[PDB]
Amino acid sequence: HMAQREVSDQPITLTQDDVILVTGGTGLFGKAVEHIVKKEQIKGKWVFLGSKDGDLRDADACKQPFEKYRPTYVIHLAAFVMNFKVSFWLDNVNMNNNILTCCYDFGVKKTISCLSTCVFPDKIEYPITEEKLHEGPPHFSNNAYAYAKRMLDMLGRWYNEKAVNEGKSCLFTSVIPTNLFGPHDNFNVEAGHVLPGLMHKCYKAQQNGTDFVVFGSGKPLRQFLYSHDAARMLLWTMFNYQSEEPIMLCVSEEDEKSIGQVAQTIKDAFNFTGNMVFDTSKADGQYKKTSSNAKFLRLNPTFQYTPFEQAIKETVQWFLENYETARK
Amino acid sequence: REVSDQPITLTQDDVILVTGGTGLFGKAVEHIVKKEQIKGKWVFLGSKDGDLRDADACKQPFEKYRPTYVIHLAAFVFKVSFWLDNVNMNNNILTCCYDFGVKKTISCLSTCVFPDKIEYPITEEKLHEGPPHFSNNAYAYAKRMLDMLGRWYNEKAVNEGKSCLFTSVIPTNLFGPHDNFNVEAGHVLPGLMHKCYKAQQNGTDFVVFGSGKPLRQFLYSHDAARMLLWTMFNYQSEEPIMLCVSEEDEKSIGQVAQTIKDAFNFTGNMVFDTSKADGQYKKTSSNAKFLRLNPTFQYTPFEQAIKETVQWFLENYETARK
Numbered sequence: 001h002m003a004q005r006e007v008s009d010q011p012i013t014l015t016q017d018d019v020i021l022v023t024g025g026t027g028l029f030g031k032a033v034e035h036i037v038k039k040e041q042i043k044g045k046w047v048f049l050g051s052k053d054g055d056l057r058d059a060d061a062c063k064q065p066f067e068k069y070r071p072t073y074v075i076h077l078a079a080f081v082m083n084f085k086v087s088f089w090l091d092n093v094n095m096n097n098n099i100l101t102c103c104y105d106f107g108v109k110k111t112i113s114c115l116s117t118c119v120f121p122d123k124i125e126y127p128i129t130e131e132k133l134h135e136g137p138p139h140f141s142n143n144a145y146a147y148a149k150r151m152l153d154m155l156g157r158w159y160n161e162k163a164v165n166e167g168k169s170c171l172f173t174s175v176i177p178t179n180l181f182g183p184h185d186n187f188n189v190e191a192g193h194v195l196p197g198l199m200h201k202c203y204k205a206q207q208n209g210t211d212f213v214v215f216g217s218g219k220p221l222r223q224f225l226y227s228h229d230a231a232r233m234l235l236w237t238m239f240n241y242q243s244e245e246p247i248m249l250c251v252s253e254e255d256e257k258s259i260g261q262v263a264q265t266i267k268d269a270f271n272f273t274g275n276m277v278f279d280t281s282k283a284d285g286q287y288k289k290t291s292s293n294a295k296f297l298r299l300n301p302t303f304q305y306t307p308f309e310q311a312i313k314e315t316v317q318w319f320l321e322n323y324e325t326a327r328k
Numbered sequence: 329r330e331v332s333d334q335p336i337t338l339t340q341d342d343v344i345l346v347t348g349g350t351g352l353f354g355k356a357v358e359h360i361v362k363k364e365q366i367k368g369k370w371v372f373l374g375s376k377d378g379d380l381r382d383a384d385a386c387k388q389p390f391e392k393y394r395p396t397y398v399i400h401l402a403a404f405v406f407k408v409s410f411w412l413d414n415v416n417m418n419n420n421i422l423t424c425c426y427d428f429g430v431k432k433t434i435s436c437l438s439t440c441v442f443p444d445k446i447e448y449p450i451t452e453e454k455l456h457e458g459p460p461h462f463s464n465n466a467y468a469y470a471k472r473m474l475d476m477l478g479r480w481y482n483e484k485a486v487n488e489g490k491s492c493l494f495t496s497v498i499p500t501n502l503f504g505p506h507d508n509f510n511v512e513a514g515h516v517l518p519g520l521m522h523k524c525y526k527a528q529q530n531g532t533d534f535v536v537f538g539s540g541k542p543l544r545q546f547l548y549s550h551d552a553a554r555m556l557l558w559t560m561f562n563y564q565s566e567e568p569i570m571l572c573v574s575e576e577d578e579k580s581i582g583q584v585a586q587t588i589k590d591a592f593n594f595t596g597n598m599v600f601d602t603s604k605a606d607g608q609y610k611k612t613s614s615n616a617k618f619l620r621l622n623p624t625f626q627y628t629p630f631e632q633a634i635k636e637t638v639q640w641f642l643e644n645y646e647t648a649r650k
């Protein structure tokens with residue numbers, strides 16, 4: 001199909017009659033959407049679903065928010081992450097089948113779903129680009145979750161195929177955010193991502209007078225995306241991006257940071273004065289795992305990212321001000 | 329190892345549930361089971377037993393028959409429907425097999441689910457090495473996720489100390505009694521039989537679409553039924569096992585058509601319509617694994633299998649699918 005370009009000529013303008021349903025809207029990424037929507041006074045009725053709002057795995061329960069709100073746009077962020085691989089497949093594929101089907105049946109204009117970097121093929125040449133998504137099996141460790149994400153992508157394409165044949169205005173696409181951090185992250189030191197975990201380990205050292213320990217050697221390099229940046233990128237995707245191919249949301253390779261840089265940045269943001277030490281008994285992760293921002297950079301060249309240091313200082317200030325209610 | 333030390337022996341207390349059991353493959357299983365006096369109560373489910381896509385309806389034959397073994401042959405073949413109908417049915421069936429303590433479950437994959445870019449011969453390990461062809465990729469991905477779901481239920485069984493094994497077979501170009509003989513909608517070999525019959529019955533010429541040059545491996549359904557039963561009794565690997573004849577036994581479409589003509593004693597003219605285009609030349613599948621594990625297996629020769637299928641078709645023309 002040579003017909004349409006990856007972007008629309010003009011952006012979609014939302015009106016007050018628009019209703020935007022956001023599943024998984026209370027996590028790190030969803031709370032950032034809410035922040036940007038409020039800060040930039042984006043029009044429309046925005047509905048941020050949470051766990052108490054209904055079990056999206058159940059087909060009938062999943063129909064309830066669509067019947068109630070009749071959304072014109074859907075941002076699908078929810079995922080299930082009894083820890084059995086069976087559950088990871090069943091719970092995610094059932095919710096994904098239900099959500100996308102509801103989107104089609106209720107005539108949602110555009111639906112954006114969320115994938116993650118860990119669903120790409122295990123055997124892969126870097127940098128990761130979106131076209132490589134299905135080119136071989138994922139890593140065995142999370143392959144139930146990985147395949148549900150892969151079939152979430154495919155189901156969107158199949159629903160795009162159906163919308164054409166039936167003459168409906170329904171578009172399905174997806175974003176791939178890479179290493180999000182920011183307010184409302186999960187700060188459990190054992191179960192959280194390394195960056196929010198370091199923030200919690202630094203805070204704990206500051207309260208106890210203990211040294212601040214980085215579990216790696218500090219050498220590996222990663223690209224980190226501030227959740228508020230990712231939210232602006234996602235809104236840009238909702239307003240402009242027409243392609244069914246996923247789009248990576250990540251910062252450039254030139255902006256990669258080491259764990260040691262990250263941990264040092266955290267220390268300065270905390271103004272922690274004690275010692276920061278690296279535990280080399282723990283083996284280092286993989287050195288570089290670069291993903292490619294070429295498509296977004298090509299399609300939105302004027303986009304401005306938040307400096308890493310400012311994003312850490314903002315994130316640390318939220319953590320200090322909200323420690324009691326942060327997820328731990 | 330891939331094969332158990334001793335074969336499973338079914339008793340009169342065993343109950344074997346077969347989904348999709350009333351087509352070509354299930355009919356062959358039912359035939360070998362009767363011919364070889366295989367024990368157990370065999371239940372061949374069909375549409376009348378419940379919509380297996382519905383999780384509750386799918387539970388009914390498990391609660392009713394309490395199977396010890398399951399052979400899962402059912403499949404639905406908009407792309408949306410093929411993804412949803414197959415993925416729900418498969419999810420339901422394998423979950424029921426686990427929850428109800430089925431000892432061994434054998435599911436069925438197809439040749440068309442392997443990666444589009446592939447080095448021939450097709451071998452079982454290449455199943456997930458890349459995307460399938462676009463034309464049927466919803467059906468393909470449902471089959472690939474049926475394979476994965478069985479491996480994942482095997483992991484749960486181990487972690488829980490449960491005796492539930494899941495595996496699968498890949499039958500390649502089945503033919504035989506109780507096939508679909510519709511000339512427009514049937515597979516090449518069953519369609520050709522009906523075309524040859526109709527040409528002999530109207531006096532017309534026997535017209536074969538294409539040049540007759542492409543080569544395929546054709547497997548008699550009764551052979552495949554013997555291979556599947558062998559797999560139930562002996563095969564312990566969760567890796568799928570290809571069921572096909574060897575590459576040396578491939579036949580060309582022209583060879584298929586000629587054997588059919590001689591089987592019907594059709595004396596008129598067999599012409600080739602080269603205005604219709606030829607499919608791919610060879611799409612060869614590998615039986616090395618079955619050959620290594622069951623080296624004494626004896627196949628029905630192609631001519632003998634065509635003759636048996638032709639006689640069944642003639643004796644049961646009124647009730648055959650056409």
Ligand SMILES: [Cl-]
Binds near residue numbers: 194195
């Ligand atoms: Cl991490």
